[PDB]
Amino acid sequence: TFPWLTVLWAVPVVGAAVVILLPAAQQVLAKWLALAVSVLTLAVTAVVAIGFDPAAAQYQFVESHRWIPSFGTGYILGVDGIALALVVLTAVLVPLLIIAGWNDASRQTGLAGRSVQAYLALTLAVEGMVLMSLVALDILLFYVFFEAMLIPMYFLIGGFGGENRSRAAVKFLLYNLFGGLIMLAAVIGLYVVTAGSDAFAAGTFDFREIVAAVSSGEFAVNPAIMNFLFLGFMFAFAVKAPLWPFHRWLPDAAVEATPASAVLMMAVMDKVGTFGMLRYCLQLFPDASTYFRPVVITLAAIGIVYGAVLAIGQTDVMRLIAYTSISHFGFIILGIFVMTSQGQSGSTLYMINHGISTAALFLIAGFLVSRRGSRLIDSYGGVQKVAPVLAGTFLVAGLATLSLPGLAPFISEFLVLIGTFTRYPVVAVFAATALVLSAVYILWTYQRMMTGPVRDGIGDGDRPVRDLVPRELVVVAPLLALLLVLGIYPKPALDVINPAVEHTLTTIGQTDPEPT
Amino acid sequence: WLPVWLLIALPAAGATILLLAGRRSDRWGHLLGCAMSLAAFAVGTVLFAGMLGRSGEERAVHEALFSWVPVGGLQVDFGLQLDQLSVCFVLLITGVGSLIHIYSIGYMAEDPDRRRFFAYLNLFLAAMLLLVLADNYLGLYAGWEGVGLASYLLIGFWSHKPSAATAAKKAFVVNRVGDMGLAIALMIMFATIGSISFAGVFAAAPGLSEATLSAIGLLLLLGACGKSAQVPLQSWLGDAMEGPTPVSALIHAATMVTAGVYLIVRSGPIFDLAPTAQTGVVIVGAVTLLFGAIIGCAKDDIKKALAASTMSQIGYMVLAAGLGPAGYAFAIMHLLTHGFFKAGLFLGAGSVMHAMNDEVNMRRYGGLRKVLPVTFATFGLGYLAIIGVPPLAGFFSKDGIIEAALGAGGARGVILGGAAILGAGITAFYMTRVMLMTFFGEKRWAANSHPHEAPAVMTWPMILLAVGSVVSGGALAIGGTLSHWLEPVVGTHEAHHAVPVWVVTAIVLAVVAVGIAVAYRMYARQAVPEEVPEGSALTVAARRDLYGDAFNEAVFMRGGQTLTAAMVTVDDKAVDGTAGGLAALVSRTSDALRQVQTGFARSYALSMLGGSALVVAAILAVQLW
């Protein structure tokens, strides 16, 4: 059998290496080669998805090799429905981010003229590491790449990006790396516990073996040790997926980085955190996850409402979008930890829809910010008159993030909310208030920016706000199309997500509560 | 054979084209939108005829298109239920929207972006059709939020006007509060029944408990308040008038406001088993009817007065619906008649505004009766329907609603009847004031206004709407045709006849006559003042919409801003503060330790001789200390 996942994750990295190795004089050719690598990765993802059988075994396209037996970790890849969803999201988004950031690195000087090549290579490396993390079926391999993906993104923020890029990159890398190091403590504890248990020949990192051992009850561990390990994993994923109050790194990095890099971070990269909760936290520590479910549920709900409120209070458009994304990750984690088929399937579909919707909205806001010279909300006005298409696409993206039923995110949010209510009705209502808060922070921003009299310098002056160029349409139209398709007909995604979710719940001894 | 879902497909597709074709379709897009609306009307008429050709349970058409959200026990399948109740709304929406599109042809003829406006109109029609046709509450929610979005877009039209944008935002936010309430309702429904479709919900409706059913009904009533513009969510109607007059006509006559009443009636099984929810609905309907009637009497703008009248009529319909099956059929009939005559009135008002150089103040207008004979006739027909002259459509519907309210019985019945009578009187007073200030008295025109008759395109819709306001009410009430039609789906009911029908009719006529006489004395016998006269505290309170906006600005805007500032301070000082404090502690400790690196070899040797610490630790390791 062909090692499809190995190629899937290797192609982005090899392409990044080739791109960075290109001479300085091939900048345009470097851009086209990076786009071609992204498209090849997307084709690999497409064939994997097409061959994926949701009715078949839980894990498919499994590749297994000995990598570091001394550490009890093997090169084990395999994609489930949950992993496949995020893999498809990353594969589809990365080319769109590349064609969105086509010229983001143009103005950067020095670096032996490799600025464009460096930017493209870093983006492709992030894509490859994210993909391999998604497909990895080994705790230590997954941790390796979950932590490694930070560095390319750290360079991508610090290099390129705004004036305060350095501080933002430092805060990013240090928050995420402190979390990853706590994960390292938890992972070493997991290895030690597995070694001390007769369930395994020795200390083990094979995710499937450990999951089976814990589910069968053979790998019984002291609930305190399991609680500590789960706390480490959850803390790492909570800094990665911006669970409140650990979110404070995300706004600065998102605003200071280039729009494509910021989207890659929030839309794609940060998802690895939430996915990490869904695959490991629940399945490695079902008892600890169940015990801590109230606390994590409360934190997710507070994140939803608090991020919505802050987004309402923001004056910078991009920071507003970042806080919106924080609230959306709040929804994702709330749906994950409620441990309901509806809740978890909705959270996965929400990972997908939020990736797409935040990508669209953030990229459109980035285009608008590039047209002008300031990110301030008050710096704009009546933009709809000058750039009808830009304003229309921004409205559609906001409506998506606003969770309209005609667009994909609602389907997920609904599904999450439903799942939350059956177990924690008060939390469900508290989250549902975010439906109002999202209308607020989307439509008020639209009113402030696109409506009213055309602000000075928007339709005239040296930096007028011209409508979207064809390339920006190439970026935007696919995202809006995915939003509309996953809103009208989400079933193709759910058909893949629902089985994997069931297998997950079956694994953790959880079931949707019976109706009264 | 024509499937039901075409009703949704024809308009939406049109909108899609008009949204995507862009400037290429700017020259003829309005024609395509009008064609889509007319095709929807034709399909609705054909489906209604097919339902008439069927009897009993065969009358309704249930069609499941595809599995939609098959997640575990949810298993929500996209499906449309065009029942006897649904078909009435389908016909009303399609016909009135087609007439409004035809009118908008001329109304938006001189304004660019008419193609985009018609795109929004088609999307609005599609959303309303999906709302009324969806066989499950999730599809109902989809249509609900679609109607909210379309209302935002249309009210938000003419984005260069800040007031229009603010009105659109306010409308969407208030609608979204009711949408959140309806979302809580759906979550409760799924949690308790495990199903979302109408069929399963109503099959399991008898179970659960009075408390659960009351909670569901109250949340649905909150949603309706959102759409139906019932208190406390009734404040957004007034500002929504910044949008084009056809938008106001479409919103108030069908779809947007009609959605709350449709949700209440379609949810009839829940409210029938939830007496407390029905009581809440009745209270809301009466209170909002009174509030709208009071506010309308003070509004000096034709659009604002019409909006207040729409709020009052929706309140009457909501009270009828909350009265249970006794008023459900009467509520639907009054809703249809209101669609007709309110649409006519809004079209007439738009014609007046166009003739008056977009003037909206009722004080500036006057003596227009001769100036716009066709507009005057249409406005007068709609006015007679709204007041409820015996020949007019509104007479029968309002009389039935009032009779049901009075027959509710006991203190509740007496209160409802008194509220209805006061509402009828105040409605007569306000409508007479508006009509007199508009079409009677001195011209009072300003800026050398030169009124001209509206074109045929905007006129024919006016004549048809007047014909509807004249006929539909009787056509539905005489012989109880509408009541019998809704009987198979809406709860059947007998007549309590607490008071003779002629007695209630006479009382209503007397109240209307008293209001008309008061209005004539105030504004017909006495010349209409050119400036806003002073008055009692109540007059200014009504001028400020009974402070409804101020309350919202007083409690939620101000309280919301306070909460936002508090959370921003928490983020900047508390949350980020912990990381800042950690960094400060690390830096301070690093500096303190670096001070230990004194640079003197002898200090380092002293630290090394601190190896006495290692020696003592090793020795004590066996001391067991």
Ligand SMILES: CCCCCCCCCCC(=O)OC[C@H](COP(=O)(O)O[C@H]1[C@H](O[C@H]2O[C@H](CO)[C@@H](O)[C@H](O)[C@@H]2O)[C@H](O)[C@@H](O)[C@H](O)[C@@H]1O[C@@H]1O[C@H](COC(=O)CCCCCCCCCC)[C@@H](O)[C@H](O)[C@@H]1O)OC(=O)CCCCCCC
């Ligand atoms: C259960 C949860 C319920 C919570 C719902 C509350 C939603 C948010 C309320 C504020 C809002 O909704 O948004 C107003 C501002 C921007 O205000 P705006 O600038 O947009 O407009 C202003 C206008 O200023 C200029 O605005 C432009 C030019 O700038 C021009 O066109 C205008 O003519 C004008 O000159 C003008 O001068 C100012 O005095 C006004 O404040 C204008 O807004 C005004 O809001 C008021 C409130 O509205 C609402 O729906 C609230 C009611 C909805 C629910 C209440 C009842 C439900 C009960 C259920 C049982 C209305 O009276 C009009 O809506 C009016 O329009 O947002 C913010 O601060 C948000 C800050 C924190 C919000 C977080 C809330 C938790």
